[PDB]
Each structure stands twice: as C-alpha cells, then as structure tokens.
Design a protein around this ligand. Structure first.
Ligand SMILES: Nc1ncnc2c1ncn2[C@@H]1O[C@H](COP(=O)(O)OP(=O)(O)OP(=O)(O)O)[C@@H](O)[C@H]1O
Ligand SMILES: Nc1ncnc2c1ncn2[C@@H]1O[C@H](COP(=O)(O)OP(=O)(O)OP(=O)(O)O)[C@@H](O)[C@H]1O
Ligand SMILES: Nc1ncnc2c1ncn2[C@@H]1O[C@H](COP(=O)(O)OP(=O)(O)O)[C@@H](O)[C@H]1O
Ligand SMILES: [Mg+2]
Ligand SMILES: [Mg+2]
Ligand SMILES: [Mg+2]
Ligand SMILES: [Mg+2]
Lengths: 238, 343, 343, 352, 351, 321
C-alpha cells in the first residue's frame, strides 16, 4: 500500500523547497487514488485528478511524487494545459491518475459605486472561474482538485542539484561569490520575472568577461565578486 | 435495435440522479420513449415511375426535437446525459456560442456530427441514432453587416435538425456519410430576459404604481407559460423555432434541494467522503449551512464539491493516525469559527 | 412514354394538400424534362439547317415556412426515374475559402447515380435555402456563391472528384431552387403602390395581412428578385417563378386528417403500438388548427400542439389497463383532462 | 486558304441577331490567327538579322446579361479548325490555395488537342466571367491574385501543364478571348466623361445644344455609354493595369432592343418559339403564335431587364396551362392571340 | 574576350527605344559578370580578393520595356540563363512549384552541365507580386521572399535530377528581378513629405511655374520613380533581407509621345512593319503617312498601358480594311491624319 | 589544446569589424565546447540583430577556424515529418557528411541554424511551430537515425541566428508605458538600446514556442553598424568593398582612387537606406556606373572620386594616357 500523506509530504520536502501548502494538498490527493486500488485488490468513488495551477517546479513535484511517472506537454501521467482536443482528452480522463499543469489570469471572482459604511487570486479558485477562462465544464468536472503553486526568494539561493566553479576548476582557477550579496544576483531573476529558469542565463552573463580573461596567459588565482551585479569583478593574481 | 423502456421506468432512472425537476423529467421521459419507439416503427416499387401507382404505403413517423429552458446550474445538461445513459445512445455536446457561418473563422456547424461519430466509436449506425445536445442556443439569437454566429448559425442548423447527409472524416480526405434524419436534437438555453417577454405578452404589470411567496419562483411560474409566439420575439428565427416542437421549463434549485443534492443523488458528494474507512459525521445544520454558503457564494450545485473538499483537507491528512476513529463536522465548523472534531 | 403531367399531379396531390399551382408547374416541368432528354440525346461548316436542340428552364419555388416547399421536393423525388440530389446552399462558399465547393452539388448527384456519368447528366438538383445566398472584403458566402453557380445553371463541363476527377456536363441537368425570401412581399408592395412624389403636372397635380401577403407575392417578377439581392445574371436563368401560398385553418384541419402521413394518423400509430385507440372528435380538429395558426410556423404548428395535449396519455397509457383515449374540444381548450376508457 | 472574314461572319449571322461589330471583330480575329500561325509556324551581336514575328491581339467582349457574349463564343468554337478550350474564371485561385490551378486552362486545351502539343500551342482559349476576377487586409486569392497569375498566359510563356508528369506548352501563339458583363462599368465611364460634376466648372464645354418607354431610355443610355469604354475605365473597375494592357481589343456588345427581341423569337437557329412548337410536335399538337402576339411577348420580355432570357420566362408562363392540358386531350392546335398574351383570354384550343 | 559594354549596348539599342540608363546598367553588369567569373572561378595570407555579385532590380511601369530588355539580353548571353515567373512559386511544403525550380530550369538550359549552370544568369519576372500583404502564413507572398534569400546570397542547393538530386552553388549565379510595383509612386511622394499637413519652414522648389493633361501624370510618375530608394521597397511589402541583396535598382521611365512615334517605325519587329506584313499576305499595301503616326501616338499615350497601347489603336483603325480587303480587288490601303481622327474612312485604291 | 578565446577573438577581428561583444561570447562558447569535449551542460546560442550586421559573417568566419565538424542550414527548407520538403533530421545528416561520416567525431559538431525567425509561429503549419516542435528533439539530446547510423545530439552545440524584424517593437510595448499627466542615427540607436533588453518572454511573443526559447539560454544581440564602422568596413577588413572595385578596374589596367573624404561621404549615404553593410555596395555601383561603362577598351588610365563626385556635384574625374 501507499505511505501516509504525511510521509509523502516529507519526501516531497526532500526535493521541493517551497510550496508546503501545495505539497500538502497534493499529498492528500494522490494518496486517495492509490488507496482505492488496495481496496479493490454508496457507489464507489469517482477518479480524482489534479490541476496544478510559470517556470515553477510543478513538474518536479509530480516527479518527486513518483510508478511510471510518465509526463508530456501540449500508474500515473502528467500533462500541460482546442475545445475539440479537450473533449477528446475528456474521453480518456474518465485508466490512470493524471495531472494537468497550467497558468492563467483573471481567475478572481471580480466594488461599491457610492457611499457606504497571488494568494487573493488563486486560493479562491472556482469552477465557475475556470469556465470563464474557457475550459469545458465537463472537463473541469474531471479535474475536481485545483492546487495553487507558490510564486518563488531564499529558495532560489537554497535550491541545490554557483555550480560553475567546476568549469574554472578545470581552468586551474578558483571561483567564489559573496553570499551576502548573492541575494541580489538571485533578486535579478525576481525582477526579470524569469522564474527559476533565468539562473543559467544570468550566470552566463556575469561570468562572461571572467571566462574570457581567466583561461590562459593570465593569473590562476581565485576570481571574486561582491555586489558586482549591482562596480567591476575582482581577482587575486598569482 | 431494442425495445425502449416505458416512460415510468425512465422517470425512475432520472429520479436517481436529478433532484426535484419532476415536470422536466416527465416530459423528457415521454419524448425520449416516443423517439426511439418510432425509429423502431419506420425501420427498413420503392423508387421510380412505379411509385405513381402505389396504392398504399406505411405511415412514416417523424421526429420531435426538444428545447430545454432554464437557469444555469439547474441540471439541463445533467438531464440529457442521464437520458443518453438510460439508453446507451451516443451523446454529443455542442457549444453554439463557438459556431459561425461557413467561410468564417469560427467552428463549422457540422463538427458536432464528427464528435457524435467519435462518441459512437465510428459505429455509424449507432452514431445515426444519437442525441445531440446543442448548448447555449439562446446566444445565437438574432440581434435587434453579416450576422455570422447569430442568425447565420440559426439558418445553418435548419437542415441539420431536419434530416440531411453530412460528410465526416474517418479515424484514419476519405469520409463517411452520417444521416441526421434520426438523430434527436436537444437544444438548451437560459433565455435570459424571456420572462419579460412572457409577462408583457400575458398582460402582467412590472412597472409603475401597483405592480403586485417565494423569492425567484415568480420567474419559474412565468417561464412555465413560454410559447413559440415569444421565442420568436426573443430573436429566434421562425424556421428554427418550428423545428423544436417540444419545450421544457426547468426551475431554479432551492437550498431545500441543494441539501438534497448533498445526500440523495447516486453521485452525491457526501456519501463519497463518508464512505472512507475509519470515518464522517456531518450535522444536519451543517448541510443547511453548506447549502446556504453555496447560494451566498452564488455557485450552483457544481460548487458543492469545491466547498466540501476545502473543509475536509485537514482531516484527510491527519486521518491515517489511528487515534482518529471519527471525524465530525458541525454548523460552526462550516462557518470556519471552529476546528473539526477529532475523536 | 413518360407519364403525363396530369398523372404526376395526381401523385403529388396525395401528400401535399394545397398549392395546386406549384403541383401543376412541377408536373409539367418533369414531363418536359423527359421530352427534352430524349430530344437532346440520341471543323469548317455549311448547312441549310441543324436539328433543333431543346434548352431547359430551371424553376424557383417561393413561400413561407411550413408551406410545403421541401415536401414538394421530397415527394417528387420519389417518383423520378432519373437521379436526383437535394442539397443546401448554406454550406457553399466561393473557391479558395473554407466551406463546401459548389461542385459538391454535382458530386452528390454523381454518387446518387451510382457513378454512371451518362445517367447523372440527366438528373434533377433541388437547391434549398437559395434566399440565403442573396447579396448584402468579398461576400464569400453570398454573392460569391451566386456568381459561381452561373455556369452550373447554364451548363458547363464540371470536374467532379469521385470514388483523378470525372467530367460531368451539366447542360441537361435541371435545377430547382427554393427559398422563403422573407421580406420580398414588402419589395413587391413598394413596386406597385408607390406613385409620383411631388406636384406632378398641369393635370392632376396636388389574418387579412396574411391574405395580402399571399395576394401580393403572386405578382413577384424578376425586378423584385434583383432588388432582393439576387444578381441579374442569376435571376435571368431561373425563368420559372412559382409562389406557394400560406395555409389556412381550412387546410390545417385538412392536413390533420386528409393527406398521406397526416399528423394525427402518426400519433394513432404510436398509440396503436401500445394497443390503444386515440379518438379526436371533429370539433377538436377545428380547435387544434385554430391554435396552430398562432404558433406562426405553418403546418409545423400542428405537432407542437399534439405533443402538448397527449403528454399525459402518452405517459399513463404504456402497460396500463387503458384501451382508448378520447380528445374533445374541452380537452383542447385546456379545461378538462382527456377521457380514459379502461378494459 | 483559311476562310475569309466574310464567310465566318455569315456563319455567326445565322445564330446571333444584331451585334454586327462583334461578329466582324471575331471573324477578322480568327482569320488573323490562321495568318499568324502559318507565318509563325550561341551569342553573336553583329552581322545578323531576324524576320518579323507577328504577334497576337487578345480580345475582350463586354456587354449586358443575355446579349450574346457566350452565344458568340460557343457558335464560333463550332467553326474553328484549331483546338479550343472554354472555361470559367470563377473556378481559379492563386497558387498554393484550394481550387483549380490557372494552368488547368491549358491542360483542358491540351486534352482537346488529343495531347498533340504542337497543335495545342495554336489553340484559342475563351475566358468567361472575367469581370468576377475584379480586384476589391487579406490576400485576394481569387480575383486580383488570379489576374496577376494570368499575366504569364496572355503573353508568351512556357507552362508546365501536368498530364515527370508535366508537358511543357509554349503559350505564345495561343489566342485568348475574354468575356464579362462588367456590371456597373457605365457608371464609371460617365463619371470619366465629366457627366457627373460639382461646382461651376466655368471653363468646361457649353453643352447648350439644340435640345440635345422608360426602359428604352435606360437601355439607350447604357448602350450609348459603353461605346466609349476605354482601358482607363477597366482599370477603375478593378482590372490590373498589366492585365488590361494585354487585352488590346475591347468589344462592347449592345443591349437587345425590342425590335431585335421580335427577331430572336422567330429568326435565328434554335429560336425560342421553334423550340416550343417542337415540344408540341411530340404531343401531335400545333402551336400558332401570331405576329401581333410576338410584339407583345417581346414588349413584356424587355421589362424583365434580363435580355433574351426574358423571352423564355414569358413563354413558360403563357403555355403552362396548354402544356398541362394538351398531352392527352385530343387537342389539334393551340392558338395564341395578342389578347392571350395580355391575359384577357385563355389560349384557344381546336378539338380533333 | 568578353564583349565590352558598349557592344552589348549597341545590340540592345536595336530592339529597345529610349531606355539608355537600363541599357547601360545591364551592359555593365553583364560585362562585370564575365569579368568576375574569369577571376572568381591562426592568420592566413596570400589569398586573392573574391568579387561578390551585385544583383539587379528593374522597376519601371507597364509596357516600358522591362521584359523586352530581359528577353533581348538573353540573346547576348554566352552563359546559361533561365527566365521564370515569381507567381508560380510557393514556400516549401505547400502545393505549387518550389523555389528550387528556378535553379532546375537553369540546369536544364545548361544541359545539366553543373559547372556551366553554376555561373548562369536568372531573370525573376513579376517580383512585385510576391510583396507581402499590409500575421498571415503568406504561402505565395512573403513566404516566397523568405525562401529566395538563400538563393540570392550564395548557398548550396539540391535540385532534382532529370532521371535523385545534384548539388549546385548559387554563389556566382546572377539574379535579375523586375516588376511594375504599382503604387510605389504614392509611397515615394509620401516619403518626400509631399502629403504633409500644416505649415513648415523648409521649401525645396518653386513648384508650378509651367503652362496634354495625361502627359503631366506621366511626367510626375517618372519624376518620383527616379528617386526610388530602399526605404520605399520595404514600405511596399518587400522584406529588408530581400531588398538588401538586390543592390542595383534601375527605374525605367514611361514613354513620351516622342518615343511612341519612334517605336512604331524604328525598332526590329516594329508595330507598323508587322501590320503591313499582314496586308502583304492579302497582296495589299498599307500606307500610313508620317503625320498619322503622331496622331496614333497621342491616342496611345492616353491609354495608360504603355507601348502595348499602340496596337490597341491599330486594331481599332484597321478593322474595316482587314474585313473588306482579304478577298477583294483592293490593292492598297491609305491612312492619314484625318482617318486616325475618325473624320474619314480609310482610302481604298482599287485594282 | 583548445585555442584560448582571445586567440579566436583575434581571428574574428580579421574579418568582422563591429560587434566586439558577440565576438567574446562566441570565442568563450567555442572554448567551452572544446573544454566540454573531455571529462564531460551546454548552452545553445541565439544571434539576434539587424540585417547586414554580421550574423552570418560571424558564423561563416568562425567555421574557418573550427576543428569540430560543422553544418550550415536554413530553417526555411524544413517541414513537418511526412510533408514534401527537407526533413528536420537532415540538419544532422549534413553534419554527418562533414568529417566523412565519422559518427564518433560528428557527435561533437557545431550546427548553425540560420533564419530561425522564419519558422516563427503565426496566430496545421507545415513550417512554423510544426518545425520548432521537431528541433526540440535535437536541441535536447536524442539518438537520431541518419542515412543508416544513430547519432546522439547530446553533445552537439547549436548556434541560431535570425533578424527577428519587428522584435524591437514587441520589446517597446513591454519596456515602456504611455503615461499622461504633469508628473538617421537617432532612429537607429533607439533600436540598438531597446534590442539590448530583449528577454525570453519577448521571443515567445514573436512566436517561438516556450520550450524552444528555453533551449537557447544565451541571446546575443548584434548592434547596428554606425557610420564610423561603415567607413572602416570600406577600407579595413579582408575582402573590403573598395579593394574589390579596385580589382575590377585594375584588370582593365585602370587605377581607381577614392579620397578619404569620399569614404566618409559614402558611409553617410549607406547609413540612410538601413540595409546594413550591403548598403555600401548599392552606392558604389550607383556611383561607378559611368566610369565602368566608359573605361573598358579605352585610353583612360585612372578614375578619381572625391566628395564632390559622391555628392553628385561633379562627374567622376578621368585621367588619360
Ligand atoms: N521601350 C520599348 N521599345 C520598343 N518596344 C517596346 C518598348 N516597350 C515596350 N515595347 C513593346 O511592347 C511589348 C511589351 O513590352 P514589355 O514586355 O517589355 O513590357 P513590360 O514593361 O515588361 O510589361 P509588364 O509590366 O506588363 O510585364 C514589346 O514586346 C514591344 O513590342
Ligand atoms: N561587421 C561587419 N564587418 C565586415 N563586413 C561586414 C559586416 N557586416 C556585414 N558585412 C558585409 O556585409 C555582408 C552582409 O552581412 P552578413 O553576411 O553577416 O549578413 P547578416 O547580417 O547575417 O544578414 P541577413 O539577415 O541578411 O542574413 C557580409 O557578408 C559582409 O560582406
Ligand atoms: N437537479 C440536480 N440534481 C443533481 N445534481 C445537479 C442538479 N443540478 C445541477 N447538478 C450538478 O451541477 C452540475 C453542472 O451541471 P448542470 O447544472 O446540468 O449544467 P447547466 O448549468 O448547463 O444546467 C452537474 O454535473 C451536477 O453535478
Ligand atoms: Mg423546407
Ligand atoms: Mg454568357
Ligand atoms: Mg513585362
Ligand atoms: Mg546573414
């Protein structure tokens, strides 16, 4: 049988840093799928399916939840997201557990015109709101649980798999960065609104000139930076 | 083919899924029974000049499409699905807001017969007895330079509702031919503002001094008297209104019925969670609170699964703990003023 | 020989109650078709003469909804020795745009002829909904379709894709168009009622609506179809114009009993399948026809009433001890229940 | 030798009433086509010459509905020693879009030539409904996109006509004859002639000349005005300048007068009334229409504003009751007097 | 050796009247092509210069001599050539001819000698018709321009063999485009602030000061086109990548009446010589007097269809003679200033 | 050993004048490719910028100094699988024909996908978004069957280039706001600033699918060639424009002299027509037309161009034997 959802949540916390709220609901939901199987091994319960409502770790959460762990974009399955295609998927979702990822705008219920005596956007999701976004009502009825994901800040610095130090190490040179300012390098991803995918691009920009000067005919000592993204990059020389 | 179940045996089936709407269930039971009975009664000198001297022929029986009238969330499409599932006939839903006249960017009229044939799993002869639910037909009404959508779609359905050949692409440019001559069409709409047309026709007063019980039953009372004379005035084309000879009024759900929808239907929300092992008690005043909360949220019975799922999230995590023999919900717990009882 | 037009009329007269003029025109037109195709079908030039080739004369049918325009088409087609196609002008578009190609009209006819090309070239094509292609960025579904049909109607070598393409010569194919032409009586009224506007000269300066609707439509002329928005090219090659009249109570009472597939014999059959006899008395027939006029949808009104009256018998009769059901003027007036006679 | 224009004109004159100008143009044009055919059948820059190559002049036929445009084209095509194709421009679309490709015009000409390419390269092509290709955002996939696609064909070019499956047809000597109604062109010519103006325009011409049926006025007004059609008016109608320039010969067919409609009933081959009395021959019945009724029928037909096709609409309307009652009624003859046409009588019957 | 540009010019002069600038550009470009082909056939050193190509665009109005220049130059070329029409083509994956058909047609002319095809000249007619529409998948519009970019600049292309494909490299193939570009004058004038609203200090000319009305429209259109610039073709609907690699641009001018009078008699295949060749078959002589030709050229100029308007006049005048001569005893047809004016019937000299 | 990046940079500087930044990124990325070839992570490259900026010139010159196999491809040829036209896998097939089918070496190659903006989506495409969905299976590693052998793309480095004409306008609608209240060189440099702030969310709006943009982690916008660069391009680079015309004249035994003040005059005229460094050729052909016609087979021995000739105020000078 499956483990209790509290232990599922703990293992999800081993690879997803934030989203403790979403991790809790998903843990409660998927446990209710697999338990019915071990009951089969007043009508029986209908199948349970999830909406995971950019760049977020929602696919990583489903993978950390893992079963075949199959995934796709457009046992268990996972999916992204015309009305013809949604009607066709509705014939298959009726089988194995599935997850639909996505993002949307205007899902709030939407003031007074006279005198009188986001967490706000996505905690109050309604089927009537998902219908207003144009999903087919019968397909919305196939996805009865909607979990909202956290907008990703320390988690950007706290995630793990500055890892480029191995590339300079292959150049016989050290690399380091001032953690007390790395929060400002991570904050550039927050103002770019890249999500977590921006990190790789940002590193390729700041390190470019170091990567041009360090490789040869140059001092092998450690490169260093502090607030350099806010200045010029420093180095020791040897 | 197979013998249709009598209307009362259909009515007792719909009674298991759709709360309260006795009159709609009655009319639909008779209409569906008649439709498949006559198909079973006109089933296969037949052509050419020999017909001129044909001394007699079998009376061909002709179909009677349906119009469902009523507020949103009142079970219109829920009924049509139970109707289909009561007879295993293929069933399709078309959102008429999406259609446009041929030549233009929207979806074409004939795409509905394709998804019927898919629902029939390409068994053409079973696709060709199906039920096609035309949803939101109120929204292709004519507006008061070409009315694509609108009147343009109404005039395009006219020889779909009556029998005509349509070409449908196969499962794989090759196509199969589906003949709509025996498909039952069930239009549906919330004809918003039709009550004003009826009352104005019926010589009832709603303005000025001396206009003058239930809060909204006055609209259900009045919609019951709908007739073709004023579906035309709403903006439906006469050619189109004439092809939908059966009209069915559906009333709005009360909180009295929403409390029944929580327990009573075969797919009710509460029996699902209450079926879990090591488990719920829900106080009857909590059911009333949930019903009022749905109305106050102004979400229909579709909302009941949403509110109840949000209340039971915290028990569902804790409940594997062996000390939880019972989880209890009460009137003030639904109000969020108290934590659920763990005992 | 082909059947004389007085024999074809006697066949149409069995299904269509009114409209003795439209029966007469269609009967002669089919008779002339057979005479033509026998006549018309088995360089440097000088001769004293060549054999006279008979041209064709396409037909246009006009009249209100529920008047019998499609019933005349579907009745005639059963007694044709040549192939036929019935098709809808609302599906077509001009070339290059999404829609049906106009040549599909002939492809459907070639299929009906079982791909015997030399037989398809003798067929008859019924174009329904011809008023919907009237003129109003190209008019891809309107004037663009009218101007594409021009050389189908006069006759050309058409490439038909079937079963590579097949060349079908439409020179001998006869086309019959039909439409309601809503608002053409208004155009005819202007044509003959309007006088001079100003001070003229030194001499002389300074259901009765439905009755007029039919009396005025009888005077339709080519100038009125051109004002309605059919282009002169197209009106010029539909030379035979045929106005159908609306239906009175005197006919609606007659449509209930008299023709083949009459409205009540259909319901008597549905009750006969339940071993039940339905009695509608003569005084009820007048009332059912009286109510059917205020449905404003022609002979389709009759079944909308019958489906409302019989709802209770049709629910209670199946598997019951009832042996006969009796409908009287009081029942039609809505002030009594239908009488049940029991075994 | 090829037949002289006189001989060809005398053939067209047997089927088409009036339009002596269009008959002359078509007769001289095909005579010149034979003369061009029989004549036309490294790099060095000096000391060399070339014999004169004759070049075709494509034709455009303009005119009202029902006036003889397609009749002239069809009765001419029966008199050609050289392959021909007749086709409808409304079927064509720009390359890459659904519909018939513009080179299908040449493919059906090659089929007419039994795939003898060197004979197809001499053919005559009749393009009906050329006004519907008028220009009028979005691609004009049929219309302006078809006009600019035909420029390859109206001048000399090599077409990869499909039966590789493609046979190259050199379209240089192929002669094109276009037809259209150009509905509304006279409204363009009058505005060109300053016959519509605002303000005083005082330098303009004085026009103060010596004082110089209601349907006949409109017919004479339009027919007067088309005779002045020019290239600059086809451009304003929406033909592409490249497209007008390579249709050098413009022929306005005049509208049919009432006096000509009386001839069309009796006089030409396959005339309207000879067809109907031939229909009565199968019923062993005569039809007699009298020379006073003929003028009455032509007068009613002119009011249909639809050319010679109006004559059929009336004949079908008068004879309907005879044609229904005659087939087995021992009727020996049907008599139509002027009073029958005016609706003051039923058609008289002679009983056997 | 290559023929010098004045020799090619003196040949073009025998067929085309009054396009001396385009005759120069084509003559120099053909000379540069041969001259370039003869030449073009860690650090690095001792590599020779490569002589890149300068493709040509011909812009002038309808009936101005664009195709006639192309069709005459194709007789001077001692190297393979292909003439093709841009309205046939569509982008890859859609029905119609591929862009690569342009090079296959060139390879056929070279008898599939790839080395000789690889230095040929390609004439693209009707290049204005692939101009994009003012988003859409323009299968035959902009999508054709995007496909041509890799031909106009040098790339290896696989063309289907006559039988399989063979590679050929467009790097030395010279492309000559032409089009009418109807409406470009309305773009150049709007670029020149000739449609500006309100007051403004800078003024360039004292316009006016002059004084047949159809002659002024011709003079204006010729003036604007003489100032055509890449900024305009990008506004007409050509893409910047496409305009940028047609470096040489050649506005042909419209034809004066002074020129139309010359085109009637002067060239090879001139209009009047080839009409009187038709009467020669009927054993008849057509005489047009020198003051009738001026009257014909006036009437033709008003047609707004260029030199191909001349035969529209000639077909209108001679229709009666051509119908009445061909089996008669008429020996000569005489035309004069009054016959062309329509005051008079053409003179018939009887046997 | 791998060439240091400032060695490659000094090679690129022999051919490309303008973009001292894009030279650095390419030199670093080519070094990293060599350095990732053993003890093996990649980032693919997208070259944005104006027409005639040097995008194809950068790619085509870099391939001259490259040991690893390379392929040059135009995305305008590709189509969805099963339609007529070139198959997307043929991009790798052209690479495998380089280095003579050594699959062990081909897996380390560099692929230059030019004209990637032309497969942009549009608001069933045989090109467009249909082609992009295929390239994902190349940019992310897959074992692709090639005419047969299987080639792993995992270590292939893809470079992309495109003009993205109109992408500046897409950024403009994102980067600025139409506030309302109390609170030529200028047209070109306004774009050079704006295009420098391109972000992945803008390339998605241009019609590149979100996964395809994510597979191109580093975007390199080439700047527009200003007049100070264009004048240098005339004299300075290998195969410089004017040395080509001097060769065309010198084989007529004629010397072409262009004064330094004419060069500055040519460069201004080229800046106006906004077709990049190709504008230089359009003016030189316009200016030199008359002497190229008159000079061959003539006694002229030198042609002199000066700022009055470029300005149209004078005819070209001729000197004769
Ligand atoms: N400058 C000219 N000199 C002599 N004849 C001319 C001249 N221009 C046109 N012609 C005559 O007109 C005919 C058509 O000219 P041409 O094909 O060159 O026009 P074009 O400008 O290419 O037209 P389009 O824009 O329609 O393609 C020539 O064959 C010739 O008879
Ligand atoms: N920065 C430069 N330095 C030197 N020469 C240049 C430069 N930019 C352009 N050129 C010259 O101009 C030509 C056009 O530039 P290039 O080939 O790089 O095209 P591109 O910028 O990629 O444009 P397109 O979008 O048309 O492909 C070059 O091949 C070269 O001859
Ligand atoms: N009378 C009812 N009895 C039981 N369930 C209902 C009833 N009305 C609505 N529902 C619930 O509401 C959902 C939405 O369906 P429905 O109300 O039929 O759509 P519509 O708004 O088109 O009528 C149904 O799936 C069903 O779960
Ligand atoms: Mg009908
Ligand atoms: Mg015609
Ligand atoms: Mg030309
Ligand atoms: Mg480039």
């Amino acid at each position: 049988p499956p483990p209790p959802p509290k232990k599922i949540y703990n293992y999800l916390d081993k690879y997803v840093v934030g989203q403790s709220f979403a991790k809790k609901v998903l843990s409660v939901a998927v446990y209710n799928h697999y338990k019915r199987i071990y009951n089969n091994i007043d009508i029986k319960l209908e199948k349970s399916n999830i909406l995971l409502l950019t760049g977020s770790g929602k696919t990583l959460l489903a993978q950390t939840l893992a079963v075949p762990f199959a995934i796709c974009d457009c046992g268990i399955v996972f999916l992204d997201q015309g009305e013809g295609v949604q009607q066709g998927l509705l014939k298959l979702l009726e089988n194995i557990l599935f997850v639909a990822s996505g993002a949307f705008n205007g899902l709030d219920r939407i003031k007074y015109l006279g005198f009188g005596t986001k967490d706000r956007l996505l905690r109050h999701v309604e089927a009537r709101d998902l219908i207003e976004f144009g999903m087919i009502p019968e397909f919305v009825g196939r996805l009865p649980v909607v979990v909202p994901l956290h907008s990703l800040k320390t988690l950007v610095q706290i995630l793990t798999e500055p890892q480029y130090q191995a590339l300079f190490s292959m150049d016989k040179c050290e690399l380091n960065v001032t953690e007390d300012a790395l929060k400002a390098i991570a904050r550039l991803a927050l103002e770019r609104k890249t999500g977590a995918r921006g990190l790789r691009s940002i590193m390729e920009k700041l390190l470019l000139e170091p990567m041009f000067e360090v490789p040869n005919s140059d001092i092998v000592c450690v490169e260093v930076d502090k607030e350099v993204v806010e200045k010029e990059p420093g180095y020791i020389r040897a």
